[PDB]
Amino acid sequence: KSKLPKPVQDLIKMIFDVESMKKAMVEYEIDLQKMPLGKLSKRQIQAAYSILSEVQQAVSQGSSDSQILDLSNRFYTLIPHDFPPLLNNADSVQAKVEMLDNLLDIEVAYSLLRGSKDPIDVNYEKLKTDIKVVDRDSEEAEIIRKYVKNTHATTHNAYDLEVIDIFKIEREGECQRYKPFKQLHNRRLLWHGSRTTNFAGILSQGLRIAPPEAPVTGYMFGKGIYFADMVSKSANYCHTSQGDPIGLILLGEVALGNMYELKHASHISKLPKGKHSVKGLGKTTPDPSANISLDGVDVPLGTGISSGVNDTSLLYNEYIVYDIAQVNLKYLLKLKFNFK
Numbered sequence: 001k002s003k004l005p006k007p008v009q010d011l012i013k014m015i016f017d018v019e020s021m022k023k024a025m026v027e028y029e030i031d032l033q034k035m036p037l038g039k040l041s042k043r044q045i046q047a048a049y050s051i052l053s054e055v056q057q058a059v060s061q062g063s064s065d066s067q068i069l070d071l072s073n074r075f076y077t078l079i080p081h082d083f084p085p086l087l088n089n090a091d092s093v094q095a096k097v098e099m100l101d102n103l104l105d106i107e108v109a110y111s112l113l114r115g116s117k118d119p120i121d122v123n124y125e126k127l128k129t130d131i132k133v134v135d136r137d138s139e140e141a142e143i144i145r146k147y148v149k150n151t152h153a154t155t156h157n158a159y160d161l162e163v164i165d166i167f168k169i170e171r172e173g174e175c176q177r178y179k180p181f182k183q184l185h186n187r188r189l190l191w192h193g194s195r196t197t198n199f200a201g202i203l204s205q206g207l208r209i210a211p212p213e214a215p216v217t218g219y220m221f222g223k224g225i226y227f228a229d230m231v232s233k234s235a236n237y238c239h240t241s242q243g244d245p246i247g248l249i250l251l252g253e254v255a256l257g258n259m260y261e262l263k264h265a266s267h268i269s270k271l272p273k274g275k276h277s278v279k280g281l282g283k284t285t286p287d288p289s290a291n292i293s294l295d296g297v298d299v300p301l302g303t304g305i306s307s308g309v310n311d312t313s314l315l316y317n318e319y320i321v322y323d324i325a326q327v328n329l330k331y332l333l334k335l336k337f338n339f340k
C-alpha cells in the first residue's frame with residue numbers, strides 16, 4: 001500500500017488514466033480499431049510530423065495537387081483516422097500538428113506505464129519529479145490563488161476557476177540544467193496549460209521543443225515553449241468538458257531575458273542576437289502596477305487592463321523561449337472549471 005498523500009495519489013491516477021488517453025485520441029478522430037493505444041509509436045508520430053513538414057513545403061513551393069494528395073494519403077496511412085480531409089493548407093496542417101503534439105505525449109505516458117511495491121508508488125517514480133502538496137494557508141498558496149482570480153480574462157467568461165490542490169514540483173536534473181540561465185534578467189512565473197493526458201510526458205521529460213520533424217510553420221511563433229500570463233488563456237488548453245471538469249496547469253519560472261516583441265505570426269527557428277524570448281502582444285495585458293515577487297521570480301498577478309496596442313493578432317499576451325534550459329517547473333495546480 002502506497003505512502004504518498006491522497007491529493008498526490010489522485011494526481012498520479014489522473015495522469016496515468018488509460019481511459020482519458022483513449023478519450024483524447026477519439027476527440028482527435030483517430031481510428032482506435034486500426035490503431036489502438038498499444039500500437040502507438042514514437043517514430044510513427046515522428047514520421048507523421050515529417051509528412052506534415054513535407055506538406056507545408058509542397059504547398060509553399062509550387063507542387064502538383066497530385067503531389068500534396070499523395071503526401072496527404074501517406075499521413076492517413078501512417079495515422080489511421082475515422083470521420084478524409086485533404087492536407088493542402090496551413091489550417092489543415094495546424095490541426096494535424098496539434099493532434100500529433102497530443103499523440104507524442106500520450107505515447108510517452110503509455111511507454112512509461114507499460115514498462116513488489118504499490119503500482120501508484122511505481123508510476124510516481126517513473127515521473128522522476130518530486131511532488132509535494134503546498135499547504136492552503138502558506139504565502140505560496142496566497143500568491144498562486146490571487147494570480148488565478150485576477151488574470152482570468154473577461155472574454156473567457158464561459159467558466160470560473162476553483163483551486164483544488166497546489167503542488168510544488170521538482171523535476172530531476174532541471175535545476176542543474178537551469179543553472180546557466182539561473183543568472184538571466186527578466187524572470188517570470190508563467191502559466192502552461194495542457195491536457196491531463198500530456199502531464200506524464202511533461203513531468204518525466206519536462207517541457208520540450210517539438211520534434212525536429214515538426215514543421216516550424218505549425219506553431220504561431222515557431223518551435224518554442226509557450227506560456228501565458230492570463231490563467232484562462234492556458235486553462236482553455238486543458239480542454240475540460242463535463243465528463244471531466246477538472247484540468248491541470250503548470251507554473252514555470254521562465255528566463256525571458258530580452259523579449260523580441262511581435263504582434264503577428266513568426267515561424268522562427270532561432271532568436272535574433274540580443275534576444276532570449278518572444279512576447280506576442282495582446283490587446284489586454286495584466287496590469288504591471290500590481291506585480292509581485294516570489295522566490296526571485298516576478299509574478300504578473302495584476303488585473304487585465306488594455307496594453308494600448310490595437311493592430312495585433314492576439315487578444316492576450318504569450319511568451320516563447322527556444323531553449324529547454326530556460327524553464328524551471330515550479331508548481332502543478334489541479335483546477336475545477338465551473339461552466340455557465
Ligand SMILES: O=C(c1cc(Cc2n[nH]c(=O)c3ccccc23)ccc1F)N1CCN(C(=O)C2CC2)CC1
Nearest residue numbers: 101104192193208210219225226227228234237318
Ligand atoms: O509549448 C508548446 C506549444 C503550445 C501551444 C498551445 C498552448 N498551450 N498551453 C499554453 O499554456 C499556451 C499559452 C500561450 C500560447 C499557447 C499555449 C502552441 C504552440 C506550442 F508550441 N509546445 C507544443 C510543441 N511541443 C512539444 O513538445 C510537442 C509534443 C511534441 C513543445 C511544447
